[PDB]
Amino acid sequence: PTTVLLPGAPPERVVDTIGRGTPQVASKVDPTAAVFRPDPTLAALGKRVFFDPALSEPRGMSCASCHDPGRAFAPTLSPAALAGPRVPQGSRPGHFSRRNAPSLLYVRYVPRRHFYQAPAPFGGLFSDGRADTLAEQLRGPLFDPDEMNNASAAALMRKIGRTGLGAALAGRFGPSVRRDPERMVRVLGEAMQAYLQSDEMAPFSSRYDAYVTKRAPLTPQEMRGLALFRNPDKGNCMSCHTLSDTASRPERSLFTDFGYDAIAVPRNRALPANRDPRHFDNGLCDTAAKLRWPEPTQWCAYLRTPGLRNVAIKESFMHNGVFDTLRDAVAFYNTRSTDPARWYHGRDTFDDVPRAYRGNVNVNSTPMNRRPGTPPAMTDADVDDLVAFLRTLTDARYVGLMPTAPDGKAARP
Numbered sequence: 001p002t003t004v005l006l007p008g009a010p011p012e013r014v015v016d017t018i019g020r021g022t023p024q025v026a027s028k029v030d031p032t033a034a035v036f037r038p039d040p041t042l043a044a045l046g047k048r049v050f051f052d053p054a055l056s057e058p059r060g061m062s063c064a065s066c067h068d069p070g071r072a073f074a075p076t077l078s079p080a081a082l083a084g085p086r087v088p089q090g091s092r093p094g095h096f097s098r099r100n101a102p103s104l105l106y107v108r109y110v111p112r113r114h115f116y117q118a119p120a121p122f123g124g125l126f127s128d129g130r131a132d133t134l135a136e137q138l139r140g141p142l143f144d145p146d147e148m149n150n151a152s153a154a155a156l157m158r159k160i161g162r163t164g165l166g167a168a169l170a171g172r173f174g175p176s177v178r179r180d181p182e183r184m185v186r187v188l189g190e191a192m193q194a195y196l197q198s199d200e201m202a203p204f205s206s207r208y209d210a211y212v213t214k215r216a217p218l219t220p221q222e223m224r225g226l227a228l229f230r231n232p233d234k235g236n237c238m239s240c241h242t243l244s245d246t247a248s249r250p251e252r253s254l255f256t257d258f259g260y261d262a263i264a265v266p267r268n269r270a271l272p273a274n275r276d277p278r279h280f281d282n283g284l285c286d287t288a289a290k291l292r293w294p295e296p297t298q299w300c301a302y303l304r305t306p307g308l309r310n311v312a313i314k315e316s317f318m319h320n321g322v323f324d325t326l327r328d329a330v331a332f333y334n335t336r337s338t339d340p341a342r343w344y345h346g347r348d349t350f351d352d353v354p355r356a357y358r359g360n361v362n363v364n365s366t367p368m369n370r371r372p373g374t375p376p377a378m379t380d381a382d383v384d385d386l387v388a389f390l391r392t393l394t395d396a397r398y399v400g401l402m403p404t405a406p407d408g409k410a411a412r413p
């Protein structure tokens with residue numbers, strides 16, 4: 001028995017099934033083994049969908065409204081979003097996403113959900129892995145009242161069917177796209193998958209990529225940061241945000257293994273759902289329960305480790321948008337454990353994890369494993385050097401959006 005976890009990759013041997021059909025596999029998914037066969041006409045249809053502002057209610061919001069091509073397909077936040085929750089605003093005033101949105105560059109390397117050995121979960125789209133594929137993912141934004149707010153697949157089908165996009169989809173997929181709501185959603189997903197898997201959506205054009213391939217050097221400070229990033233006794237970042245500068249092949253450096261961990265970033269008290277003090281976004285365990293994985297609450301507070309390419313142009317950081325500077329996101333790792341009150345709004349422990357799940361939080365990975373009264377693993381100069389290294393991961397098109405002072409905030413329109 002085998003399963004294919006990335007497009008065109010070799011089938012992987014399945015050793016077991018977890019819950020409703022999540023495969024456990026015998027070997028690590030290798031991103032270099034995927035094969036993305038170009039499909040220019042289907043990818044162009046996906047791009048047409050991506051930029052179509054008729055696909056929201058009220059009209060005016062496209063996928064690009066939260067995934068700006070000018071910012072590595074990460075959000076350029078609206079004024080209300082900047083002034084309030086620091087996550088994307090949806091199609092209406094006063095409605096916002098429940099989480100921050102990531103860059104969609106390199107998203108084609110997010111594998112299907114799987115376990116690999118205890119065995120650990122990997123893959124799935126969204127930060128809680130609740131969509132198995134890009135085709136399934138777009139059901140989220142299309143029908144979420146806090147995002148694009150289409151009322152139903154039936155309503156969206158009727159709307160699209162009256163437009164040129166409807167004609168283009170019917171031309172390619174047949175006339176029933178206008179009469180079968182679930183077929184319409186499925187073929188929107190097929191088109192989108194082709195666009196998001198196209199080569200232009202994985203450019204590998206950063207200065208780090210030039211250092212890996214063309215041997216174009218980084219600065220001494222950037223090299224210090226790279227060494228801290230891979231130092232298990234200081235940054236230890238590479239243990240989750242994995243990289244390999246080998247074979248001059250940039251795709252071995254995606255800065256994530258697509259696994260899950262629980263680092264317990266501070267509560268974003270400006271997020272609407274957090275007005276309820278009993279509400280916590282618990283991440284992966286909600287997906288685990290839907291998939292009937294065993295003992296799903298062991299995964300509460302776990303979130304998918306994000307890749308760090310183009311991180312330095314984002315306007316807010318982490319799944320809840322809680323940090324507004326890259327340096328704060330890095331500094332959090334250094335003193336979360338030694339100085340919890342600085343990070344958790346005065347509390348001595350995590351303020352965005354229910355008491356019931358505080359034991360799920362990682363307190364043994366360096367640098368988050370030092371009790372108060374112990375010196376932190378790194379100095380402030382070390383943190384500065386790590387930021388300098390992360391800034392080398394910006395694709396060439398976008399370097400002007402990084403703050404010119406590295407401790408600052410990304411450029412805003």
Ligand code: HEC
Pocket residue numbers: 050061062063064065066067088089090091097098099100101102104107110124125126127128134137138141142146147148192
């Ligand atoms: C702002 C209101 C959004 C709009 C409009 C769209 N997306 Fe988005 N997207 C948004 C958020 C807040 C998130 C993360 C949510 C989570 O629970 O983690 C996403 C995520 C995606 C992803 C997954 C990326 C990954 O897991 O690495 C993809 C593939 C994606 N978004 C695509 C997508 C498309 C195709 C959209 C138009 C139909 C679309 N998004 C709109 C917020 C918003």
Ligand code: HEC
Pocket residue numbers: 102229234235236237238239240241260261262263264265303304305306307308311316317318319320329330333362365366367386
């Ligand atoms: C596994 C235990 C991790 C270690 C060690 C490090 N990171 Fe991490 N990182 C991890 C997760 C699960 C998350 C998401 C948490 C959430 O609440 O969303 C992150 C996130 C980041 C970010 C934000 C990226 C963004 O797109 O918002 C950055 C900037 C980042 N991590 C940096 C980073 C550095 C420099 C590390 C060594 C000091 C490091 N991380 C370690 C998981 C893990």
Ligand SMILES: [Cl-]
Pocket residue numbers: 154181
């Ligand atoms: Cl109908």
Ligand SMILES: [Cl-]
Pocket residue numbers: 267268269270322
């Ligand atoms: Cl806050």
